[PDB]
Amino acid sequence: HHHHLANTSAHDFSYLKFVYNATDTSLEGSYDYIVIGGGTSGCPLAATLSEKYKVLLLERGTIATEYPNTLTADGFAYNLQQQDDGKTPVERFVSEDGIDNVRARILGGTTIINAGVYARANISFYSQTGIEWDLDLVNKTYEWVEDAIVVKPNNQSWQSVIGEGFLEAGILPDNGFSLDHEAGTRLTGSTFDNNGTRHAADELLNKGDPNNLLVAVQASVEKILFSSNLSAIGVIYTDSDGNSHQAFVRGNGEVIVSAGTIGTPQLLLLSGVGPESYLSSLNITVVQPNPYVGQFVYDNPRNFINILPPNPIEASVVTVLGIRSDYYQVSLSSLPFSTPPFSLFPTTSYPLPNSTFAHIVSQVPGPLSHGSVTLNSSSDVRIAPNIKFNYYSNSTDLANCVSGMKKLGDLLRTKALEPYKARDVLGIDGFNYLGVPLPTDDASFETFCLDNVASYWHYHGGSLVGKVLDDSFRVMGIKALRVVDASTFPYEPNSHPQGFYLMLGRYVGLQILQERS
């Protein structure tokens, strides 16, 4: 079941032969499919559709060769440390809760900037949704992604320490190496290969048909165009010089929005698809009223402590996961820095580490708390929308963080972690901490959870199946319009969702092709 995994190899940019600047007006015209957003779901979706049909993929960012630190594990922090000048692969934002965050702006989407952790969805997820999944095809599609960009990670000293700690702390059983989201401790896959080269969703464009697939970069899609039976017919997009362009679908073809949790509700709202009284209050003509566009937007909380060992530890990428139903835990080890990677810590005024440190982390599942995306500009898609997640508004989320923080306490008490204490005392105050240490009444853990929350970066929702979309990802009430990306589900598929959303892009592409045949 692992014969098919990818090998160590250079990042494959062969697909650049059909990538063009959106300034090229000859890209304007009619296609069978237009995919908006060249990201985690959008790239394998476009590649899949191009097996049989003419596809235009539109991405607002540029190509990853322009930002070489996106292409190595060693460059992960660099892209977050880099200032956001409107063109960089990392776009910075702050939720209305006050928590710093980022999204991608690059061909390949968030797989070009993320921490590389690869996992398949919790196998119970499919029946939880109630969608009639073709489960055999789901698994074939995971293998199609994994053959291109997923490896079995080599050993990393810190990842092995934390795995021994998770097991000693009772996060059982030992699952060895496995891609599956199951209770226990395991080594999972990575989209960094064993030479440190990042592999990503853009490489899945290499599986497209180069005679049928066209990609426009620095293409800012501003509006979905509709028929004068309401149908999507095309898009308006602007190029890096600011000039406008139009592209259309033809016949039985379709527009699919794959612009992410933030970008997809924004574009739907700008296009008149959304809550009637809200759009009317902005004087946006309503094309399709739906009270849920931009509603039910979720961000799984990240809580953490940081330890500063008295001897240097080796930096690592996350590969070893400790999974329970009520918390998902990992640890990153890092070099010190004097410029913070934006959103690693929730505020810019966080203390800076002067030596190597271990960031020890727990994730709240769900979450049950949710907020919304609303427009900041009623016209300009380059102006980021407002986004609020309402962290810990739901008491179940807070209770689950308390459980995870207690388990992090257990982890710090293991023999495995003992050699990284600065003082050989009995308690966990023998560690040196960067930032706030763990407090053991439930009230002190609740305060810690609330005060020190950060984004796990795994936000989702805003165009949910069952609210905005049907079980085939069609926008209800509109022909020839679908949404495929992380805006579509209200809960996580697992601890690390890129593997699910990579699969989903191709999977829905195959469903489109089958429906059409």
Ligand SMILES: Cc1cc2nc3c(=O)[nH]c(=O)nc-3n(C[C@H](O)[C@H](O)[C@H](O)COP(=O)(O)OP(=O)(O)OC[C@H]3O[C@@H](n4cnc5c(N)ncnc54)[C@H](O)[C@@H]3O)c2cc1C
């Ligand atoms: C820093 C970070 C680390 C992460 N680490 C991991 C991890 O290790 N493992 C894991 O499993 N998950 C991880 N995640 C989460 C996971 O990567 C994302 O949830 C997932 O990639 C989202 O996929 P998507 O297709 O919804 O969005 P994206 O991949 O972001 O794709 C959306 C694309 O649409 C483009 N776009 C947006 N609006 C427009 C527009 N109007 N016109 C044109 N293009 C547009 C964007 O530029 C982008 O390329 C991480 C997330 C972040 C931010």
Ligand SMILES: *[C@@H]1O[C@H](CO)[C@@H](O)[C@H](O)[C@H]1NC(C)=O
């Ligand atoms: C990796 O290479 C080996 C032999 O060199 C082979 O088993 C396998 O086909 C390769 N994997 C991929 C994904 O190409």
Ligand SMILES: *[C@@H]1O[C@H](CO)[C@@H](O)[C@H](O)[C@H]1NC(C)=O
């Ligand atoms: C597209 O062309 C413009 C000039 O017309 C240039 O400024 C920009 O860098 C180009 N973008 C890409 C992605 O090549």
Ligand SMILES: *[C@@H]1O[C@H](CO)[C@@H](O)[C@H](O)[C@H]1NC(C)=O
């Ligand atoms: C799909 O693969 C998973 C492992 O990821 C396995 O547990 C499951 O049985 C498979 N399902 C089908 C329908 O083959």
Ligand SMILES: *[C@@H]1O[C@H](CO)[C@@H](O)[C@H](O)[C@H]1NC(C)=O
């Ligand atoms: C919408 O337009 C009407 C005029 O038709 C105006 O009275 C109202 O203030 C406008 N509202 C906004 C938010 O532009």
Ligand SMILES: *[C@@H]1O[C@H](CO)[C@@H](O)[C@H](O)[C@H]1NC(C)=O
């Ligand atoms: C997997 O998903 C099911 C269904 O939502 C849930 O009950 C279970 O706790 C999950 N398991 C893990 C290990 O997250």
Ligand SMILES: *[C@@H]1O[C@H](CO)[C@@H](O)[C@H](O)[C@H]1NC(C)=O
């Ligand atoms: C736009 O965003 C800024 C920055 O968060 C905020 O202060 C402002 O209130 C927002 N404006 C609108 C109209 O949403």
Ligand SMILES: *[C@@H]1O[C@H](CO)[C@@H](O)[C@H](O)[C@H]1NC(C)=O
């Ligand atoms: C928390 O979420 C659960 C599940 O959606 C819900 O039943 C409950 O009412 C929520 N609590 C509050 C205070 O909204």
Ligand SMILES: O=Cc1ccccc1
């Ligand atoms: O789970 C992935 C991760 C990576 C860096 C920091 C926190 C979490």
